[PDB]
Design an enzyme around this catalytic site. Structure first.
Site, PDB file in Angstrom:
ATOM      1  N   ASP B 129      38.016  46.717  41.334  1.00 50.36           N
ATOM      2  CA  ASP B 129      38.031  45.600  42.275  1.00 50.36           C
ATOM      3  C   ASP B 129      36.642  44.998  42.394  1.00 50.36           C
ATOM      4  O   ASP B 129      36.175  44.684  43.493  1.00 50.36           O
ATOM      5  CB  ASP B 129      38.564  46.017  43.644  1.00 50.36           C
ATOM      6  CG  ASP B 129      39.199  44.859  44.393  1.00 50.36           C
ATOM      7  OD1 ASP B 129      40.219  44.323  43.908  1.00 50.36           O
ATOM      8  OD2 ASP B 129      38.674  44.474  45.459  1.00 50.36           O
ATOM      9  N   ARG B 133      32.561  39.622  46.690  1.00 43.88           N
ATOM     10  CA  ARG B 133      32.913  39.996  48.053  1.00 43.88           C
ATOM     11  C   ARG B 133      32.812  41.498  48.274  1.00 43.88           C
ATOM     12  O   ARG B 133      32.733  41.939  49.425  1.00 43.88           O
ATOM     13  CB  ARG B 133      34.324  39.512  48.383  1.00 43.88           C
ATOM     14  CG  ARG B 133      35.341  39.835  47.307  1.00 43.88           C
ATOM     15  CD  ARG B 133      36.766  39.680  47.806  1.00 43.88           C
ATOM     16  NE  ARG B 133      37.709  40.409  46.967  1.00 43.88           N
ATOM     17  CZ  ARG B 133      38.113  40.008  45.770  1.00 43.88           C
ATOM     18  NH1 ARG B 133      37.694  38.869  45.243  1.00 43.88           N
ATOM     19  NH2 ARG B 133      38.960  40.770  45.083  1.00 43.88           N
ATOM     20  N   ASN B 134      32.813  42.290  47.203  1.00 48.46           N
ATOM     21  CA  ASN B 134      32.722  43.739  47.301  1.00 48.46           C
ATOM     22  C   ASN B 134      31.306  44.245  47.067  1.00 48.46           C
ATOM     23  O   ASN B 134      31.103  45.455  46.931  1.00 48.46           O
ATOM     24  CB  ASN B 134      33.680  44.395  46.306  1.00 48.46           C
ATOM     25  CG  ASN B 134      35.086  44.527  46.851  1.00 48.46           C
ATOM     26  OD1 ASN B 134      35.301  44.490  48.061  1.00 48.46           O
ATOM     27  ND2 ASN B 134      36.055  44.683  45.956  1.00 48.46           N
ATOM     28  N   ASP B 147      33.416  48.735  47.740  1.00 44.03           N
ATOM     29  CA  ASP B 147      34.827  48.379  47.594  1.00 44.03           C
ATOM     30  C   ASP B 147      35.468  48.359  48.972  1.00 44.03           C
ATOM     31  O   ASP B 147      35.561  49.406  49.622  1.00 44.03           O
ATOM     32  CB  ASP B 147      35.558  49.352  46.670  1.00 44.03           C
ATOM     33  CG  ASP B 147      36.915  48.831  46.220  1.00 44.03           C
ATOM     34  OD1 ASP B 147      37.500  47.977  46.920  1.00 44.03           O
ATOM     35  OD2 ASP B 147      37.398  49.276  45.159  1.00 44.03           O
TER      36      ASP B 147
HETATM   37  C1  LIG Z   1      26.642  40.081  59.571  1.00 43.05           C
HETATM   38  N1  LIG Z   1      27.666  40.982  59.071  1.00 43.05           N
HETATM   39  C2  LIG Z   1      27.430  42.118  58.461  1.00 43.05           C
HETATM   40  C3  LIG Z   1      28.677  42.697  58.125  1.00 43.05           C
HETATM   41  C4  LIG Z   1      28.897  44.038  57.407  1.00 43.05           C
HETATM   42  O1  LIG Z   1      27.970  44.945  57.290  1.00 43.05           O
HETATM   43  C5  LIG Z   1      28.409  46.033  56.623  1.00 43.05           C
HETATM   44  N2  LIG Z   1      27.776  47.186  56.288  1.00 43.05           N
HETATM   45  C6  LIG Z   1      28.408  48.136  55.616  1.00 43.05           C
HETATM   46  N3  LIG Z   1      29.684  48.005  55.254  1.00 43.05           N
HETATM   47  C7  LIG Z   1      30.362  46.893  55.549  1.00 43.05           C
HETATM   48  O2  LIG Z   1      31.708  46.733  55.178  1.00 43.05           O
HETATM   49  C8  LIG Z   1      32.153  47.713  54.267  1.00 43.05           C
HETATM   50  C9  LIG Z   1      33.109  48.645  54.661  1.00 43.05           C
HETATM   51  C10 LIG Z   1      33.564  49.605  53.763  1.00 43.05           C
HETATM   52  C11 LIG Z   1      33.053  49.623  52.473  1.00 43.05           C
HETATM   53  N4  LIG Z   1      33.477  50.583  51.455  1.00 43.05           N
HETATM   54  C12 LIG Z   1      34.285  51.785  51.610  1.00 43.05           C
HETATM   55  O3  LIG Z   1      34.728  52.160  52.641  1.00 43.05           O
HETATM   56  C13 LIG Z   1      34.520  52.518  50.284  1.00 43.05           C
HETATM   57  C14 LIG Z   1      35.390  53.575  49.920  1.00 43.05           C
HETATM   58  N5  LIG Z   1      35.185  53.807  48.620  1.00 43.05           N
HETATM   59  C15 LIG Z   1      35.875  54.825  47.845  1.00 43.05           C
HETATM   60  N6  LIG Z   1      34.247  52.971  48.150  1.00 43.05           N
HETATM   61  C16 LIG Z   1      33.719  52.868  46.786  1.00 43.05           C
HETATM   62  C17 LIG Z   1      34.540  52.453  45.749  1.00 43.05           C
HETATM   63  C18 LIG Z   1      34.036  52.333  44.462  1.00 43.05           C
HETATM   64  C19 LIG Z   1      32.704  52.619  44.216  1.00 43.05           C
HETATM   65  F1  LIG Z   1      32.205  52.503  42.948  1.00 43.05           F
HETATM   66  C20 LIG Z   1      31.876  53.023  45.253  1.00 43.05           C
HETATM   67  C21 LIG Z   1      32.382  53.142  46.539  1.00 43.05           C
HETATM   68  C22 LIG Z   1      33.833  52.184  49.104  1.00 43.05           C
HETATM   69  O4  LIG Z   1      33.013  51.335  49.007  1.00 43.05           O
HETATM   70  C23 LIG Z   1      32.111  48.683  52.080  1.00 43.05           C
HETATM   71  C24 LIG Z   1      31.661  47.723  52.974  1.00 43.05           C
HETATM   72  C25 LIG Z   1      29.730  45.842  56.265  1.00 43.05           C
HETATM   73  C26 LIG Z   1      30.080  44.507  56.789  1.00 43.05           C
HETATM   74  C27 LIG Z   1      31.430  43.803  56.651  1.00 43.05           C
HETATM   75  C28 LIG Z   1      32.597  44.403  57.103  1.00 43.05           C
HETATM   76  C29 LIG Z   1      33.816  43.749  56.961  1.00 43.05           C
HETATM   77  C30 LIG Z   1      33.870  42.500  56.365  1.00 43.05           C
HETATM   78  C31 LIG Z   1      32.705  41.900  55.909  1.00 43.05           C
HETATM   79  N7  LIG Z   1      32.755  40.587  55.282  1.00 43.05           N
HETATM   80  C32 LIG Z   1      31.491  42.554  56.049  1.00 43.05           C
HETATM   81  C33 LIG Z   1      29.637  41.779  58.615  1.00 43.05           C
HETATM   82  N8  LIG Z   1      28.979  40.781  59.161  1.00 43.05           N
END
Ligand SMILES: Cn1cc(-c2oc3ncnc(Oc4ccc(NC(=O)c5cn(C)n(-c6ccc(F)cc6)c5=O)cc4)c3c2-c2cccc(N)c2)cn1
Ligand SMILES: Cn1cc(-c2oc3ncnc(Oc4ccc(NC(=O)c5cn(C)n(-c6ccc(F)cc6)c5=O)cc4)c3c2-c2cccc(N)c2)cn1
Lengths: 252, 249
Positions: B129, B133-134, B147
């Site tokens: 994926d 966006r990811n 992801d």
């Molecule tokens: C000003 N503002 C800042 C943020 C904001 O800040 C953030 N900080 C941290 N995370 C955020 O959201 C994430 C939540 C979960 C994950 N991912 C997992 O839970 C996963 C499980 N697996 C197995 N993997 C995987 C797979 C394959 C691989 F090779 C490696 C890993 C995952 O990545 C990634 C992002 C945000 C957001 C955010 C949140 C929602 C929507 C949007 N648009 C932004 C919003 N607004």
């Protein structure tokens, strides 16, 4: 065997010695696709007649030479192997976040792969002279292939230590030591013995000690590689069948 | 990898669709960390292989939390105030968001993603994926792969359900196109249901308006019809790194 310097893109250094360096790289091939390569720059006659002789070899257990580039300084092009060298790989396996704990059967297969590669090379009367785990590369399919970085008193046969003659049996001796490195999972040969004491140690009849959990049959094979008389040591083809039969006698 | 639920405090929603929330994570050294919490034994399976990864371009896992509320599992990731790369690109085209991203920075964005993918490719892990966006922007503006999609799926994966590392490379090409276009949706004028037919007739993403021919060549190589002809992530990473060094600062 020459490759146009245009089709080669050099990256970061993967290892560095004093007789040359090895760098990652991209090689543009005949079918348009790019291939990840290693580029050992040996910064000539005996080389040109050698890379030609090696670019004609074809064995899955012998590293494949993709060609040579000419810069104005020669550079050897080899396929990049993400898994690295067998020596470093063995140490990683003794750690929780690296390769899984290598079982006996996988270790024996490692030896079989090397014996096949050496049998092939000795059949064409080729002398490696630097056989060791550090010079063995792990292919993408975990098969080991024989190579030689070229950029080891404990891996040199007793007759080669005093005299300077190297033969297929000198390589066989180094093979026994390599077999011991694998069985020990990366231990340095002859712990507690200095490099200057190696000839005296060997002349008095001392050899590498049997590893902790190494089968008696396996130690017999590697011990045979260190007989004082080179003519008493078995050939690589003999060694290859001994190891293959032992591995088959083990459960899957 | 499990973390005591009492050590987690949940905040406002950061994005839904499960849901991702901000949060405070009390650490073992006494301090609290600003974390993101995503809520939905197959969920724990995805995170099982995640705590092992350690790469600056791969989002790091902080832990897993099992809420017996009334189970409900939750994954904890470091909070990244700069959000996702896709939204960040759109903001760049606005005068109150981050300033106009130079070509060098856009190339570095791809370089970071390529390192991440290369790291996970060597581990024989399929993302499946990969899109702008990811991708998440770290506090130091480096990009990390994460992801949380018909136009990001390789042609060989549309007909069948085959998914190889070359498919990830295909999606990487599309992501590169997203960064170069600064957020344009792939294939303007083409519908989702027309994508497989569009690709089967030899059509590919079009070269952006201000995309150096060298850059388009690299992303075009990611869309080759034969997966075996697409370059690997390591080859792609070096190609982008070399292209970036040739350009002046
Ligand atoms: C000003 N503002 C800042 C943020 C904001 O800040 C953030 N900080 C941290 N995370 C955020 O959201 C994430 C939540 C979960 C994950 N991912 C997992 O839970 C996963 C499980 N697996 C197995 N993997 C995987 C797979 C394959 C691989 F090779 C490696 C890993 C995952 O990545 C990634 C992002 C945000 C957001 C955010 C949140 C929602 C929507 C949007 N648009 C932004 C919003 N607004
Ligand atoms: C995670 N990680 C992966 C790698 C990594 O990946 C790699 N992929 C490919 N090559 C690599 O390095 C090699 C470079 C050259 C050669 N060999 C020649 O140039 C030879 C010329 N001849 C004539 N012969 C010969 C001789 C006698 C024979 F019987 C048969 C052939 C040669 O072998 C072999 C290995 C690496 C490294 C690598 C690089 C440096 C150090 C270390 N430790 C590993 C680093 N880190």
């Amino acid at each position: 065997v020459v490759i146009d310097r245009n089709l080669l893109i050099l990256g970061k250094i993967l290892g560095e010695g004093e007789f040359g360096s090895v760098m990652e790289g991209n090689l543009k091939q005949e079918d348009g696709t790019s291939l990840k390569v290693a580029v050992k720059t040996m910064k000539i006659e005996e080389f040109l007649s050698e890379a030609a002789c090696m670019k004609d070899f074809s064995h899955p257990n012998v590293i494949r030479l993709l060609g040579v580039c000419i810069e104005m300084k020669p550079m050897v092009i080899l396929p990049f192997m993400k898994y690295g060298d067998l020596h470093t790989y063995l140490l990683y396996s003794r750690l929780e976040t690296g390769p899984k704990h290598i079982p006996l059967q996988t270790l024996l297969k490692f030896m079989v792969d090397i014996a096949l590669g050496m049998e092939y090379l000795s059949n064409r009367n080729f002398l490696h002279r630097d056989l060791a785990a550090r010079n063995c590369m792990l292919r993408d399919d975990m098969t080991v292939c024989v190579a030689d970085f070229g950029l080891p008193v404990k891996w040199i046969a007793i007759e080669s230590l005093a005299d300077r003659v190297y033969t297929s049996k000198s390589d066989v001796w180094a093979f026994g030591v390599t077999m011991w490195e694998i069985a020990t999972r990366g231990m340095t040969p002859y712990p507690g013995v200095q490099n200057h004491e190696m000839y005296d140690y060997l002349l008095h009849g001392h050899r590498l000690k049997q590893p902790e959990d190494c089968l008696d049959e396996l130690y017999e094979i590697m011990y045979s590689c260190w007989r004082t008389d080179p003519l008493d040591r078995p050939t690589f083809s003999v060694l290859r069948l001994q190891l293959e039969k032992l591995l088959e006698s083990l459960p899957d």
